[PDB]
Design a protein around this ligand. Sequence first.
Ligand code: HEM
Ligand code: HEM
Lengths: 431, 57, 110, 110, 126, 126, 62, 76
Amino acid sequence: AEVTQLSNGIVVATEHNPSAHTASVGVVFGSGAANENPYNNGVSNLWKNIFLSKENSAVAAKEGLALSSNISRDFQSYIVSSLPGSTDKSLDFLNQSFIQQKANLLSSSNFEATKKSVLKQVQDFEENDHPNRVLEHLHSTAFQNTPLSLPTRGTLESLENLVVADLESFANNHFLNSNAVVVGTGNIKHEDLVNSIESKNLSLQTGTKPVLKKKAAFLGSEVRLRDDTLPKAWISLAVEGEPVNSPNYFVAKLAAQIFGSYNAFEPASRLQGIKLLDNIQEYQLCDNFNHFSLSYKDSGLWGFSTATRNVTMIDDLIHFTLKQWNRLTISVTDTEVERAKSLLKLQLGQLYESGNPVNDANLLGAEVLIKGSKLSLGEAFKKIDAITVKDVKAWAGKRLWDQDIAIAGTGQIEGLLDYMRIRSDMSMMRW
Amino acid sequence: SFSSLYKTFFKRNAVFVGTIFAGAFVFQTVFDTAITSWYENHNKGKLWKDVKARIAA
Amino acid sequence: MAFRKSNVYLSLVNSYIIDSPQPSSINYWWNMGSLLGLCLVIQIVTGIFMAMHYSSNIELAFSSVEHIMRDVHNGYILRYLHANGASFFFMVMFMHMAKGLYYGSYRSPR
Amino acid sequence: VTLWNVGVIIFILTIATAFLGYCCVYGQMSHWGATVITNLFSAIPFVGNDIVSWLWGGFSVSNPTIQRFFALHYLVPFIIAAMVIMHLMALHIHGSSNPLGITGNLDRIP
Amino acid sequence: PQSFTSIARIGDYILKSPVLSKLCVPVANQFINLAGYKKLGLKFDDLIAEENPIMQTALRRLPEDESYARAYRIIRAHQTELTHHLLPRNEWIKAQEDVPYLLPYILEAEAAAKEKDELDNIEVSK
Amino acid sequence: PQSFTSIARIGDYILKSPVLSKLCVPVANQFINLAGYKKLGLKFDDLIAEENPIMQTALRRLPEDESYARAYRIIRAHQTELTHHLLPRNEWIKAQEDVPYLLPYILEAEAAAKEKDELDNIEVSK
Amino acid sequence: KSTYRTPNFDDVLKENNDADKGRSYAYFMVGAMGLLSSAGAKSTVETFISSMTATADVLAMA
Amino acid sequence: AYTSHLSSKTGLHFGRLSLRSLTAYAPNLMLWGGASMLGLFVFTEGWPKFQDTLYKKIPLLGPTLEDHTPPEDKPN
Ligand code: HEM
Ligand code: HEM
């Protein structure tokens, strides 16, 4: 299905899908925002946004190419998608303006306009988008003083000290042949992509990226960005979870799928088979929740996020969901595991098997970059079907039962109790 | 091996408080014996069994 | 909601000793109230266990007190605990009142 | 149901209070009532003789038993007063019933 | 504490029988007449205890005019019992007027809650 | 419970006099230094007791940025004394920074309340 | 300063942050307090019960 | 082939209590019964009948509980 080969310096990965009507090539590097200082934080955002400038994207639009890019913790990608007959126009564009001739992109009077719009973008992020900024603050307090603690968008105080020297320094240090996968999704075939990446003699750079002196360590902590002038209360709360290439990767995904997501205002979201709903529905404790299992290279996160307007009963919402977490160690049933198996297979099928080949390019690039190949969906389903109740109980006794947590909150979180009551909720006194 | 120590003594609260009660039992017994032996030894020749063994010879 | 709030009595217990919001800055002089409550429990329990053996006539009061001190088991513990506990009760009560007089606890809301 | 159960606890405590108070007057029915009701507890096949010798304070109903029964016959009424306050608290959440058994929420009188 | 599906099950088995109905329904009619709730202007579905979630949903799903009539019959029964009298015999409920009007709502809410707990204790065959 | 109009009247009579201002202001500055509220990062108007309607109106009428600064200074003072330390010497409230900011709001709320209670006990001269 | 820049906690943090080690160190101390409190509570309630057994003169005239 | 339905069962339950939670909770409340029985062994240690029947047949904490006061220095 996926095929992956290694050229003179570049690894190439394709997912050919002959019933698609767009093809999409690009390059996925292996250094997201986890490879920055607290002082050049926001360099990858500036590279994402100078790759998508108006004068860089006008050249792609005249040839019928649509640009896309993504900054994450581990990886970063730069994707050019077009019609199936014009894959080499895309490879030519990605070469001649991003890979080799990046001196017109890094023009001053282009850098200034892009830096100004990125500053405006993160300023409107930091004061209007409340669930995502507390997920970023959960990351920045769970992994503090380690490289995984950095926001992917950067920081308004960090971003206004950046110059073009920092962008080209990061480019020299990280945009390398040893760090990059060239991806192709859509109905581009593999032999045509390798034949046109050896037809042009495409070479990115020849160094090797710096290796970080400390690994990401989970520190049980809290942060409270309280603001009484906001309507709701947004609370994210997580334990240390599994990183990628765990053996407990799918067990963590399944254990997050057991408690699922919920929306108070959708009538078929109130009828789910979660036993948390018939504790939080009687007094309408929350508006929504979602249980996540975020996996990175070094470490991971496992927890939930809620937004609620019932600011008087936040502590009972937290108490009821953590007493529902305890059942994974003690008394999780057969049925909850089977239901979460079916829902997890559906969620992974909707994530991978989707029509958009930009998303397939991002997923294939990050997966092949971190473990050298890509696990198929049939093998993923055969690894999900093999999970038992004892695997969930063993994983929850390891990672959940009586462990330190990380909390982040904004809004009206006066009703949220301190660290120690919430942490003492993580293990019940066997009743 | 602190992991096995935690999982057999502090993981479940039932075995935790059972260990607390068993330790309180044996602690109460041997603590009473240790204090009574030190007290009777610190007061040597002053107790009634010392006086009785003296007047029985 | 939680059962410690939904109940009639457990919500009183919760609202007074479990979820009760205390100012974070209060020091060890704010333990005198809990101390006086412990003192009151000590006095009441030891007083009941001595009144099980006390006689209150003018002829038998003193000798019943020494009957507590001499031939009931652990009676010296009970009498010395009651008497010195009453004295400790008054020392802790003087500390409670002098704290309240120092820190202005008598003022306008209280 | 919690109001009914606090009532049953109050009933048990009043029965105990009146038995002790009838035992304090120390007539002939008082004494022999005390002996048959306390020698009920000797039927427990393991610790019965020691709990009846702990109740009696000795070996039959005499001076320790009567002084005990006076101290307890004082004491249990104040436990009854506390349980009556809890009876009223458990009543007050849902209010009293009515002889129809239908809801009484529709017309009410202070 | 005996939920109405059980009562309806037994009652339908009795009423659908030729022998059991002709023996038991006269006894039930005399029981209803002796019970004397009708003399206070009440139908039987005003008598059911309403302080459980099943009857709270049934009363919430009852329509507006039925709820106003039920509230009036209840307030009238309270004022009548306050004076230790009865209602005048023209104001008594007749047998055709003593209709089961809350019973479909109670039966629907009870079937909903029974399906709810049977699907909470669902178990798969794998 | 001394009204701030009384304090302001006596204080202004002290400060506008030539002789006893130059005597009474140095002892006041020594009193302020020995009080030691500045070492906890507090201005004096954070120390005024707020559980009375005059101070509640003054704190409601205080502008929004001053109220956030006051809330942070109070939370920092609680966190400082919770650890039984002081603030470091660069974090102490300086003497030019210890301004009366709540005082005009308290004075106008007090004048309004005194005018209200004088008008409630008014007597026409007929 | 940003709010993503956590302050200095290094004076109070422990440099080896094993979960089982720190958790068992905390629970050993609270278990020792529970052990001594349970022994002391047993002895004080048995003091109060033993003050009701008999009396030495009743045992004399036994 | 193609699934057209969902063949299921309910099992046994009586409200909030299932049998699956009873299976999950059985050995830990066996441990709880053992823990409170050890608590009773604590709280009845000064009791003489439970001493002479139970607590003095411990192989090393047996002779620790008894006196061997001679029958010479006690009045009764
Ligand atoms: C408010 C708490 C109490 C205080 C301050 C208190 C104070 C005292 C004091 C100072 C004594 C004299 C002790 C001595 O000097 O030898 C005493 C004696 C006594 N008290 Fe209390 N007492 C209190 C509660 C009780 C209660 C509730 C009872 C009865 C149930 C009680 C029963 C006795 C008895 C029987 C004596 C007899 C003499 C003795 O044994 O010391 N006390 N009390
Ligand atoms: C000291 C004894 C008691 C006192 C002071 C007491 C007090 C009260 C009071 C004042 C009421 C409200 C008025 C009323 O309904 O009659 C009440 C109601 C009630 N009591 Fe008691 N009570 C006592 C004993 C008991 C006992 C022994 C029981 C039963 C076991 C009991 C069960 C009830 C019940 C069920 C109610 C509610 C009745 C209703 O309103 O429908 N009580 N109690």
